[PDB]
Design a protein around this ligand. Structure first.
Ligand SMILES: NC[C@H](O)c1ccc(O)c(O)c1
Ligand SMILES: NC[C@H](O)c1ccc(O)c(O)c1
Length: 547
C-alpha cells in the first residue's frame, strides 16, 4: 500500500494539464521532432536543475514564493513576479477547465455532437466526410468553434462581445469547486492524486494503441519522426520549448516552492526531480506520438495535407481527441472517461496554482494567513471575474493573448533571476551545504555547474532572443491589431518590472552608506549583525570564484 501510494504521488506530481493540452499544439505548430530535440535539451539542462533548486529552496526555507527570499532580500520582486504570472495563468487555465466541463456535459449522449453536421450551430459550409464524397468546416472544428465558443459572432479582439451563458455556468461550477477545495488548507489537496495518477496514463495508452492501427497513422508518424533543421535554425522552436518546459515542470510559477514548504525536512528532492523529469519526457514523447497519429489519420480522412488538418492554436486537443474518440467502439464511454480525465487534471493544476498564490501572499502577511477563507474567496472571485473576461464570444483571442504574453518571456526572466540570485549571491556552495544538511549528500559537480553557469546562460540567451526575434501575434488566419501586441507586452512587463522596482525600493528604504546599504540588501536577514563587522563574503573574489 505504501509503495503504491508513493508511486501514485510521484506520477500525479509529474503529470499536468499542460502536458496534455498545451504540448500537443506546440509540437504540431513546430513540426514534430524538431520540437522534441530542443525540448529534451532544455528539459535536461534548465528544467532539471531549476526544478531541483526550487524544490530545495521551498523545503529548506519553509516559505512560499514571496517570503522565501529572506536569504537574499532583493529578489522578493522575483517572488511577486512569479505570483503575478501564476495569477494570469490561473485565469486562462480556469477558462480551459470550463471548456472541458462543457465538453463533458455535451458528451453524455449516444450521438456525439462532434460527429456530423446538421445541428443549429452548423454553418452551410460544413462538410461531412460520411455524408459527401479547409479545417474550419469539419464537423469537430465546426462544433468547437460554434457550439462551444460561438466564435462566429466576433470580428476580432476588438469585438469580443458578451460572455456566453453556458460557458459562464460551467466556469461558475468550476470556480465553486475550486473554492470549496481550497478553503480549508493544503490537506484537502493530498487525496486527489488517485484520480489523476491513473486516468491520464490509461487514456494515453488506449489512445496510442488505437491510433497506431488507423488508416492514416503511418504518414502522420513518419512526419512526426522527420526532423527539419531549417526550423531548428529559427529560435521560435527554442523559445516555445523553453516556455513549455517551464510550464510542464511547474517551475517559475511559485507552485514548487509553496508545495515544498510543506514537505518533510528529510524528503529527497533529487530523486523527485529525476523521476518527475523522466516521466515528463516520456509522457511528452508519447503525447506527441499519439497526437501526430491522430492528425495523420485526419489528413487521410479529410483528404488534406498533414500541415492543414487542424488549428495550430489552443483547442487542438478539443478538435483532435474527440475525432479519435469518435472512431472507437462504444465511443460514448470513452468520451466520458477522457473528459473526466481532463477535468481531474485541470482541477489539480488549478488547485496547485491557486495554492501557490495563496501561500505566497499569506506567508508574507500574517493577517491574510489568519483569514484563509476570506482570502481564498477574494482570490477566487478575482480569478472568476478575469476569466469571465475571456468567456466572451471573442474569448479565444483574449485566451491566446494571455497564453502568449502572461508567461513566456516573463517566466523565463523570472526563472533566470531566481537562478542568478540564488546561485551567484546566496552562494552555490552555501546552497549545496544546505542540501547536505537537509537530505544528507552534497549535489554533484554537474548540479552546481548547471545552477551557476549553464542554466543562467541558456536562460539569458532565450530571454534575449525572445525579445529581439518576436513575431506579431496571430490566431490561425486572424492577425491581431498592433495595440493587442502592445497590451501583451505590457502584460509581460507588469510582472517583469517588479524586480528592479523592489530592488530600488529596498535600496532607498534601508539606512546607511551605499556599501552598507548593498551589504544589508545582499546579506540574509538572519545575519544582518555581520554587516556592522565589515565581514561580507560577497565583497571577496573567493566567493565569486567558487564552483
Ligand atoms: N507549422 C508546422 C506544420 O504544422 C507542420 C506539421 C507537420 C509537418 O510535417 C510539417 O512539415 C509542418
Ligand atoms: N503548469 C500550470 C501551472 O502549474 C499553473 C500556474 C498557475 C495557475 O494558476 C495554474 O492554474 C497552473
Amino acid at each position: 500500500g505504501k509503495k503504491i501510494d508513493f508511486l501514485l504521488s510521484v506520477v500525479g506530481f509529474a503529470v499536468d494539464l499542460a502536458n496534455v493540452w498545451r504540448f500537443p499544439y506546440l509540437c504540431y505548430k513546430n513540426g514534430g521532432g524538431a520540437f522534441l530535440i530542443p525540448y529534451t535539451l532544455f528539459l535536461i539542462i534548465a528544467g532539471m536543475p531549476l526544478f531541483y533548486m526550487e524544490l530545495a529552496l521551498g523545503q529548506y526555507n519553509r516559505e512560499g514564493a514571496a517570503t522565501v527570499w529572506k536569504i537574499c532580500p532583493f529578489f522578493k520582486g522575483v517572488g511577486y513576479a512569479v505570483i503575478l504570472i501564476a495569477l494570469y495563468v490561473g485565469f486562462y487555465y480556469n477558462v480551459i477547465i470550463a471548456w472541458s466541463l462543457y465538453y463533458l456535459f455535451s458528451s453524455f449522449t449516444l450521438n456525439l455532437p462532434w460527429t456530423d453536421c446538421g445541428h443549429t450551430w452548423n454553418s452551410p459550409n460544413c462538410t461531412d466526410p460520411k455524408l459527401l464524397n479547409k479545417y474550419k468546416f469539419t464537423p469537430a472544428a465546426e462544433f468547437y468553434e460554434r457550439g462551444v465558443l460561438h466564435l462566429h459572432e466576433s470580428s476580432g479582439i476588438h469585438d469580443i462581445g458578451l460572455p456566453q451563458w453556458q460557458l459562464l455556468l460551467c466556469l461558475m461550477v468550476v470556480v465553486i469547486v475550486l473554492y470549496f477545495s481550497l478553503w480549508k488548507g493544503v490537506k484537502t489537496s493530498g487525496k486527489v492524486v488517485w484520480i489523476t495518477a491513473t486516468l491520464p496514463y490509461f487514456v494515453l495508452f488506449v489512445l496510442l494503441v488505437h491510433g497506431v492501427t488507423l488508416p492514416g497513422a503511418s504518414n502522420g508518424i513518419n512526419a512526426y519522426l522527420h526532423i527539419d533543421f531549417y526550423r531548428l535554425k529559427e529560435a521560435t522552436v527554442w523559445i516555445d520549448a523553453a516556455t513549455q518546459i517551464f510550464f510542464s515542470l511547474g517551475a517559475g510559477f511559485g507552485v514548487l516552492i509553496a508545495f515544498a514548504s510543506y514537505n518533510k525536512f528529510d524528503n529527497n528532492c533529487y530523486r523527485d526531480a529525476l523521476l518527475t523529469s523522466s516521466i515528463n519526457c516520456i509522457t511528452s514523447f508519447v503525447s506527441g506520438f499519439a497526437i501526430f497519429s491522430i492528425l495523420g489519420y485526419m489528413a487521410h480522412e479529410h483528404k488534406v495535407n498533414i500541415e492543414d488538418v487542424a488549428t495550430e492554436g489552443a483547442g487542438l486537443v478539443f478538435i483532435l481527441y474527440p475525432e479519435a474518440i469518435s472512431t472507437l467502439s462504444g465511443s460514448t464511454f470513452w468520451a466520458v472517461v477522457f473528459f473526466v480525465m481532463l477535468l481531474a487534471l485541470g482541477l489539480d493544476s488549478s488547485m496547485g496554482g491557486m495554492e501557490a498564490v495563496i501561500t505566497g501572499l499569506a506567508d508574507d502577511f500574517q493577517v491574510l494567513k489568519r483569514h484563509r477563507k476570506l482570502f481564498t474567496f477574494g482570490v477566487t472571485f478575482s480569478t472568476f471575474l478575469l476569466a469571465l473576461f475571456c468567456i466572451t464570444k471573442g474569448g479565444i483571442y483574449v485566451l491566446t493573448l494571455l497564453d502568449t504574453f502572461a508567461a513566456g518571456t516573463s517566466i523565463l526572466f523570472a526563472v533566470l533571476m531566481e537562478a542568478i540570485g540564488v546561485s551567484w549571491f546566496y552562494g552555490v556552495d552555501r546552497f549545496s551545504n544546505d542540501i547536505q544538511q537537509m537530505m544528507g549528500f552534497r549535489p554533484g559537480l554537474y548540479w552546481r555547474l548547471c545552477w551557476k553557469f549553464v542554466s543562467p546562460a541558456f536562460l539569458l540567451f532565450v530571454v534575449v532572443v525572445s525579445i529581439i526575434n518576436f513575431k506579431p501575434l496571430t490566431y490561425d488566419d486572424y492577425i491581431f491589431p498592433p495595440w493587442a501586441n502592445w497590451v501583451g507586452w505590457g502584460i509581460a512587463l507588469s510582472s517583469m518590472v517588479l524586480v528592479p522596482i523592489y530592488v530600488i525600493y529596498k535600496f532607498l528604504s534601508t539606512q546607511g552608506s551605499l556599501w552598507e546599504r548593498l551589504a544589508y540588501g545582499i546579506t540574509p536577514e538572519n545575519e544582518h549583525h555581520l554587516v556592522a563587522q565589515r565581514d561580507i563574503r560577497q565583497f571577496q573574489l573567493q566567493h565569486w570564484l567558487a564552483i
